[PDB]
């Protein structure tokens, strides 16, 4: 409420004055305008903070606010004399001063629209779900074993390898060069996907892709650091909606290019790289904040962390988040290989993986809109809902496991959409029940450490199940083992629910 909220209530009072008639009672409106104008004259602007005071570039700011308050005087002088038609004159004078004097030293006036446009456009990667048909076609000719047991476990290890140090370098660099490195990493991933002939090329591609997969939390913290806490709720809601709309638009564009447009995979990846270049340009046109999470006190945070470790609900939902997130990430990693294994058809028109991705994103958004409306306390439906939904997920993984019929790929897609709708109903519930306990720095720390535990568990299960130096199990037996693993998890939470 230093300077920007005064301008916000000034714009709100302008909206009160403009579109409303009966200017005999806009005297209160004009005097609130005058109070917000006089309160925002010496309120230490951030652009003026880098400049020294008593400077000739500072006298323009004070002179502009002086002539603005003088125009408020000239408006209220005629507003008190019974003339009700001078409110439009006050609005035109405020428009001229907005064009001339105030906004030159203020910030950008379309930051919400620009952040929503970046969240809509940087998530458009129209060759996302078509990486696995591109790796198993006549263009590159990689087998199922080379993409199953040699490429994607290196993704599983690399997401552990770049989780902690990239985030530790991210929290210090104020989140804009991290997004620049993310855009360069998307450029590197799609160039190694294009210019790649061996297994090591796609291995390095997944190594660069792990950073882009890990920069989500970085982008959310960038939203938190750019936007004031009195503004963060609505802006974060529109930014999350813009990211979800961008992902859905990306999958719909992939279906319209592959199925409807009949675009070949090379031209598809070329247009994907074009949209990545637009994303790199939009990352170049960003605005860097000044504050960060843990680099712009600590004993109080450690005390409030130690005063919540004895909570059984926090540890219970944290361990369930770790196990369910590890299992979900393994299923999402291997489900495209499962889809190309069940239906090994070479026709690109019959490949409907992007349609399953779009339906999964849509049903996840529907179940996430209906997850914040779950105002159920922890006294009655804590463990039973967990056991039932994980039993449903175990049944869906079992249905995906023994699917061997060629024409049952639609049933396989519907089972995956039901699996995504069962998982994405759980994320806002756990996020609400855990995030509303401590401070926001402690919230980010606890969710980051829980993500690190989930990554450890995913790395261990990847080392056990799908490693060539350990057991070396075939992929159908691997999905059967995942089904047995979810069944054991369902039995454990069913015995613990009582």
């Amino acid at each position, epitope marked *: 409420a230093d300077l920007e909220d005064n301008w916000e209530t000034l714009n709100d009072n302008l909206k009160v004055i403009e579109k409303a008639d009966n200017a005999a009672q806009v005297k209160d409106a004009l*005097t609130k305008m005058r109070a917000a104008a*006089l*309160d925002a004259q010496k309120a230490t602007p951030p652009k003026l903070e880098d400049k020294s005071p008593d400077s000739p570039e500072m006298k323009d700011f004070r002179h502009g606010f002086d002539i603005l308050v003088g125009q408020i005087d000239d408006a209220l002088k005629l507003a*008190n004399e019974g003339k009700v038609k001078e409110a439009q004159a006050a609005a035109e004078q405020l428009k001229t001063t907005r064009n001339a004097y105030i906004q030159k030293y203020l910030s950008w006036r379309h930051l919400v629209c620009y952040l929503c446009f970046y969240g809509f456009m940087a998530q458009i990667r129209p060759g996302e779900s078509f990486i696995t048909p591109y790796l198993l076609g006549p263009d590159k000719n990689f087998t199922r074993e080379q993409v199953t047991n040699e490429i994607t476990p290196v993704l599983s290890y690399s997401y552990l390898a770049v989780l902690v140090p990239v985030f530790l370098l991210t929290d210090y660099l104020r989140y804009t060069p991290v997004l620049l490195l993310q855009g360069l990493s998307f450029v590197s991933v799609w160039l190694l996907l294009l210019l790649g002939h061996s297994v090591a090329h796609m291995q390095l591609m997944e190594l660069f892709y792990s950073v882009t997969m890990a920069a989500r939390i970085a982008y959310s913290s960038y939203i938190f650091s750019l936007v004031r806490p009195a503004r963060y709720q609505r802006v974060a809601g529109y930014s999350r909606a813009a990211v979800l709309l961008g992902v859905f638009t990306s999958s719909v564009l992939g279906q319209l290019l592959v199925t409807v447009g009949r675009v070949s995979f090379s031209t598809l990846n070329y247009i994907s790289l074009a949209f990545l270049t637009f994303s790199v340009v939009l990352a170049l046109f960003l605005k860097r904040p000044k504050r960060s999470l843990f680099f712009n006190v600590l004993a109080r945070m450690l005390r409030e962390l130690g005063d919540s470790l004895r909570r059984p609900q926090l540890r219970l939902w944290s361990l369930w988040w770790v196990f369910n997130s590890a299992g979900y990430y393994l299923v999402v990693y291997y489900v495209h290989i499962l889809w190309n294994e069940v239906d090994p058809t070479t026709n690109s028109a019959r490949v409907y993986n992007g349609a399953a991705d779009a339906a999964s994103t849509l049903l996840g958004a529907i179940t996430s809109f209906a997850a914040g409306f779950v105002k159920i306390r922890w006294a009655r439906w804590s463990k039973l809902l967990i056991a039932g939904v994980t039993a449903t997920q175990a049944g869906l993984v079992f249905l995906l496991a023994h699917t061997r019929h060629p024409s049952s790929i639609w049933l396989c897609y519907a089972a995956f959409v039901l699996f995504r709708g069962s998982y994405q109903f759980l994320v806002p519930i756990a996020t609400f029940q855990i995030a509303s306990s401590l401070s926001k720095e402690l919230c980010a720390l606890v969710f980051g450490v829980n993500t690190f535990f989930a990554t450890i568990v995913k790395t261990i299960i990847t080392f056990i199940v799908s490693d060539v130096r350990g057991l070396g199990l075939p992929v159908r037996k691997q999905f059967q083992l995942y089904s047995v693993y979810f069944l054991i998890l369902s039995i454990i939470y069913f015995l613990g629910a009582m």
Partner: antibody
Framework: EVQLVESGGGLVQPGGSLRLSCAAS????????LHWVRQAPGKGLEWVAY????????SYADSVKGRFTISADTSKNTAYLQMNSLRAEDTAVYYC?????????????????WGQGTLVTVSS | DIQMTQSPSSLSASVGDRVTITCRAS??????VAWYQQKPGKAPKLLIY???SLYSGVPSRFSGSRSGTDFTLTISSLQPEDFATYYC??????????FGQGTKVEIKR
């Protein structure tokens, strides 16, 4: 040095008329505005009216609206507050203080150069 | 129109005591309020202007503060000359000048 002085305040009748005078010796009435401040005996200070000789902005209080009138002449260097149809509430002490124009330091300076203060009374 | 309340309406302090006179506003009036000192019978005098500055002419034993819409006058050393009635004068526009209530300080006895 500059100062203010008041005149024209004595005893009147309820419903009668009375005119005030605020002779601003020294400074002009076009570079600064003039005001009127009321103090009831036993109560505190309160505001009545003002006039700006630059353009004319005669705006009154809620208790004196439609009953009093004000006039300022830039040649005689004074201010008049002509009153009529007075009531028993007007038995008070009237002041006349300087207060400058926007912008600058003379606006942020409040009523700094007051007057001696005249005494009016209304009784039958 | 707007109001300007002033709570400690009856204070009492000896020579060499610190007093606080708060003044709560109704609306979100900016840093523009004044403080007066009226002896019984005489004229008011400007003491503090713009809620923090000291008027040219009065001694430096007076000050002020600003906490949102709560303005507070403080006195370091209470001179026996400083026993009068202190008023709270907010000024935002020409025709919105409303005063306070007045605090009459007394000698502690």
């Amino acid at each position: 040095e500059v100062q203010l002085v008041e005149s024209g305040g004595g005893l009147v009748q309820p419903g009668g008329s009375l005119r005030l005078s605020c002779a601003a010796s020294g400074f002009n009435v076009v570079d600064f505005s003039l005001h009127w401040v009321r103090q009831a005996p036993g109560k505190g200070l309160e505001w009545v009216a003002y006039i700006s000789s630059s353009s004319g902005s005669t705006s009154y209080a809620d208790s004196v609206k439609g009953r009093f009138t004000i006039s300022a002449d830039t040649s005689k260097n004074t201010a008049y507050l002509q009153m009529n149809s007075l009531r028993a509430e007007d038995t008070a002490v009237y002041y006349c203080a300087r207060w400058g124009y926007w912008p600058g330091e003379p606006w942020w300076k409040a009523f700094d150069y007051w007057g001696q203060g005249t005494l009016v009374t209304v009784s039958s | 129109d707007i109001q300007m309340t002033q709570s400690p309406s009856s204070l009492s302090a000896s020579v060499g005591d610190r007093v606080t006179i708060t003044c709560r506003a109704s609306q979100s009036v900016s840093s523009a309020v004044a403080w007066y000192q009226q002896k019984p019978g005489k004229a008011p005098k400007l003491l503090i202007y713009s809620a923090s500055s000291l008027y040219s002419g009065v001694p430096s034993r007076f000050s002020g503060s600003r906490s949102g819409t709560d303005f507070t006058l403080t006195i370091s050393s209470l001179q026996p000359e400083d026993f009068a009635t202190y008023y709270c004068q907010q000024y935002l526009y020409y025709s919105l000048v409303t005063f306070g209530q007045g605090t009459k300080v007394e000698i502690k006895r």
